[PDB]
Amino acid sequence: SNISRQAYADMFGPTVGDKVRLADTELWIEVEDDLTTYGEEVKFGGGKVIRDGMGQGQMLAADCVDLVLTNALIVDHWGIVKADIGVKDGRIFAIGKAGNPDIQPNVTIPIGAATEVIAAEGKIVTAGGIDTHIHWICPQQAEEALVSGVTTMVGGGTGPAAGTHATTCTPGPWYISRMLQAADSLPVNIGLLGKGNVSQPDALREQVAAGVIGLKIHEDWGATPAAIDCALTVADEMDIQVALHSDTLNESGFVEDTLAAIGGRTIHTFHTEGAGGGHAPDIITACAHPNILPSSTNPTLPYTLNTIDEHLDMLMFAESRIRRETIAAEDVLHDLGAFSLTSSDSQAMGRVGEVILRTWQVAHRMKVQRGALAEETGDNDNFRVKRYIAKYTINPALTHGIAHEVGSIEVGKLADLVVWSPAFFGVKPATVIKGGMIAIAPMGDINASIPTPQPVHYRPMFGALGSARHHCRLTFLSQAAAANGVAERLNLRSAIAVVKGCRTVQKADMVHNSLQPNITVDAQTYEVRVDGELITSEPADVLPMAQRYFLF
């Protein structure tokens, strides 16, 4: 028969050409494609399509998926498309048309008796976020982050210790082992960073051999040219990544010195703007280099009216570090693609549950201030949406060598997915899936007749329990630890994943964020210029994804 577009959207979600506003921002996305056959969409419920002999077939478990997300609107770095998602064995099986081949056409995702269903019509589905700047100050951070849509956390720490408060470092074999064991209790994928500040290579190899997937060089432990060179030498031979928080005091040299010490070798620069740490006042110039993978921490994102005021006491010379000129420019550099990742810097000048939220706030503020990106096609912000989502998903995954397991909705990757209602996109998820099982979601009155009655607040699900958790999360290890049998020795219960490809990623590899601007910072005025033109922006007085959604 026929059906009007409005009623169709109400029943199966939007289709090609329809636009959807992201939360309460000014960003609009438009469906680029729909992988269905009109009339053959699958729907669950009394009298619907997914019933024996109809939308559900007769195949055995081996020939059908374990889970199907129906009528999902995917937003990923590669596209904004409408499709069914199939999950099998904890991984993304396919993106296409679900159903029963016996009576339906174009079925690429077979639904059988062994298939569970999540109705995603009217919902936006994304990969789980990846935060690579975690300070393990307390375990409660994993729940906060998971609830926000972040499924992988990389960083270092031992708890509320002075070392960890300041640096993302898990110092030495003993603490590393202890933290690898504690990680099986947390519902997120975890990778650890050791202390890279030493001029003795063997002291670094021990930590890698013990289990760390990276090394953090921090000025508090001494970000000297010697220590930097030593860490990068070990990284080169052990295929682990290096994260840097440079010498703010310019004690051992200026920025050009650090860059020289690095010597064109791959390195992830933390909070490249400078407020969070780094050569004052020009550490931001690092984003011009091909070997530097630049990221921002979240408190400076985006530039608002109270930003500067709150930053002094949070620091606790401050004026050399907290610069309005570089803070204003950072937002633009993100819009242009010069800054490739966003991260938190949890409880050490960063908010753990605000990585995703703040990234969208920057995109919004840039659309309002600068208009459409030169790359936009059509009357939508599709490209700007792909550029920004890549910042907390695929790019972080590439920078740390875990893109082979997580980072995006592509076949064969771990099924770490987040379901969002368009009105709450980037703010409060409808469902957070880890390794194919729901791990946390909003849940109403436990004793109620339905799951919707108040009070509704996030509560841990079966995917966050005992052995089911162990089966749905990954603990990342360096290739060395993996070979030395660390997992068996510490008796780790979770699935193991090895990092690789940390030395070969370069700026050009960052999805939609590969710009290397000819950037300069004025030593006196602190003004940031690209090709001589001044880069700057205005501070927001009010932002979306804020007072309309939070109780406090």
């Binding site: 577009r5 409005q6 329809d18 009339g39 019933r51 109809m54 009576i103 368009p422 009105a423």
Partner: protein, 101 residues
């Protein structure tokens, strides 16, 4: 401004295009209501619905997926059917075919 609002473009969507269809007059002779879903093999619906079962073989209701048509007791009406696709193999329902066709 309305959070997460749609901006659906106007028009319509043509369903099940390129497929055989046929119209059938159906009458409920039972004393209780009967409701049929979009993808149910029509030839195997509740025995109380009187119609040409032979014509409805390998067909289902030509209505949007997941919706249904109801027949109150004594109700008579004409529905449009669309043929099954895929392998055209019927399994389940009242167990009358259980195989291709």
């Amino acid at each position: 401004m309305i959070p997460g609002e749609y901006h659906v473009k106007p028009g319509q969507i043509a369903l099940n295009t390129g497929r055989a269809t046929c119209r059938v007059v159906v009458e409920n002779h039972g004393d209780r209501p009967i409701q049929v879903g979009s993808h149910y093999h029509f030839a195997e619906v509740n025995p109380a619905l009187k119609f040409d079962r032979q014509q409805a073989a390998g067909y289902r209701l030509n209505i949007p997926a997941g919706t249904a048509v109801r027949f109150e007791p004594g109700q008579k009406r004409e529905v449009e059917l669309v043929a099954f696709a895929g392998h055209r193999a019927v399994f389940g329902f009242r167990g009358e075919v259980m195989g291709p066709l």
